[PDB]
Subunit: 205 residues, 3 copies
């Protein structure tokens, strides 16, 4: 029961809402969660929202299951960082003799992989910078610029985004993180969708 997570467009007669996993499974250094979707801004597929991702750099992008991603969201990978131990001007880029000054792989600054947990909600037009980690259950307010990691089930926003408030009490959150319902076989998930939606899934255990 439910949609088919392998369909590019699960909603029939709708080419705005798309399932990410299908779109990005041909990609290298990219992992996506089963039911995570993207609500297109101008009909663009989400692969076009991932900027500066070069396999050479080998930075990997991970997105968990059941993620609600708003339109315009932009994931900036490590491709666009400039060498900064000195002048940030890319001489090597203009040839005519400057090609020799090509940077060395271990000379480019790499901030790590971008990892997004499960059940995360990302508002529209959010910009996620490199090497950022967003824990499960997090909610990132629209038009935010995520520069540092976000703790699970935290409400974060602004530019630079900051943790505004905890979604639930420490306890509940610990429970939830431990429970990990997004990691259940669909049959079960399908049966408690309501409790998952009202957070009582905890109490039945």
């Amino acid at each position: 029961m439910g949609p088919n997570p392998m369909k590019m467009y699960p909603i029939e007669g709708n080419k705005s809402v798309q399932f990410i996993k299908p779109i990005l499974e041909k990609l290298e250094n990219v992992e996506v969660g089963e039911y995570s979707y993207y609500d297109s801004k101008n009909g663009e597929t989400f692969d076009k929202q991932i900027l500066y991702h070069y396999p050479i750099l080998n930075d990997k992008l991970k997105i968990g299951k059941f993620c609600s991603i708003g339109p315009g969201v932009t994931i900036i990978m490590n491709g666009a960082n400039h060498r900064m131990d000195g002048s940030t001007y890319p001489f090597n880029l203009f040839g005519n003799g400057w090609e020799k000054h090509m940077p060395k792989l271990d000379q480019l600054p790499i901030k790590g992989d971008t990892i997004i947990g499960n059940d995360v909600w990302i508002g529209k037009d959010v910009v996620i910078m490199p090497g950022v980690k967003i824990g499960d259950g997090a909610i990132v307010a629209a038009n935010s610029v995520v520069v540092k990691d976000i703790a699970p089930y935290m409400l974060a926003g602004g530019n630079p985004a900051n943790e505004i408030k905890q979604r639930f009490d420490q306890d509940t959150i610990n429970q939830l993180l431990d429970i990990k319902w997004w990691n259940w076989p669909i049959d079960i998930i399908n049966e408690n969708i309501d409790k998952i939606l009202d957070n009582s899934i905890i109490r039945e255990v």
Copy 2:
């Protein structure tokens, strides 16, 4: 004197500057002032700058008059709020049996109506979140994101937007909030525009 506030396009040989009342009164749950205008960013009419406004949630939008609205300014109504008591994933939205979980009105969080006073100036590309009240005579810096209320004659800006400073001494402010020149027939505002542009209407009155 002055243009007829009922004219969509006040200035001739110009489909860029538009009086909003005319345009937006073709809408449910929207109240617009008389001389409030919108400076188009690419020709688009302002009604298109209002997102997720669904009559069913019954949230309304009100805009005083003599408001200067920069281009690209965006208003965000309650139509995009996800349920948050539990998981933020819109199961119901995918059908195929998940429809049953469609959230009940009393379950979606509605932050309230969004109210923007008179003589309010909003910079370009500003984003306004739901249920936010903005004060009479306030200036909102370009590129701000308004998540909380702003007091009258306050200068605010940032992401999130913060009150930066007051525009005039409390005294002067208390007065203008008293006089409310914007509520006067135009035949009158007409012969004081000068005492209004230089804040001297406070002494005539």
Copy 3:
């Protein structure tokens, strides 16, 4: 050795990378450094990125040499401020008798000149407000909004953009702000690019 600074497009066959100077020289009240380039977002020339710049207001824009300006960057000049001693509403703009109230120049808030130092890197979609100074060797994080000055060799970011951390120890900077390699006769620079790229230039000079 190196590309010709008088070429709009220094990279044969490429219409995205463009040297700012040969493009903006035709404009009055604009000063640009020789090797400063702009990475076009959608193929547009940089001049489209400078807004509300009226010669009459006589404000000027200044960009040093060897600057790496990113795509989408937007520089806003002073033709965008409204009078603020009274109402922020532009009565004169609508004419039909209101032209009377055109504001005199000394009445318009003019914040001053915008000056971008040398060897400065500005990330994508950074918006620069009027009358700001950005020091040499500074670095501005993408999606920032510059509302105030920025000391040299400072890494800044946010909205409002804030200085985050000095790129190097004072020592280095002082010598750096002293050597002024961007001011050297090219051919000398051609022989020290490597030294400039890793900051070892200090040691020699």
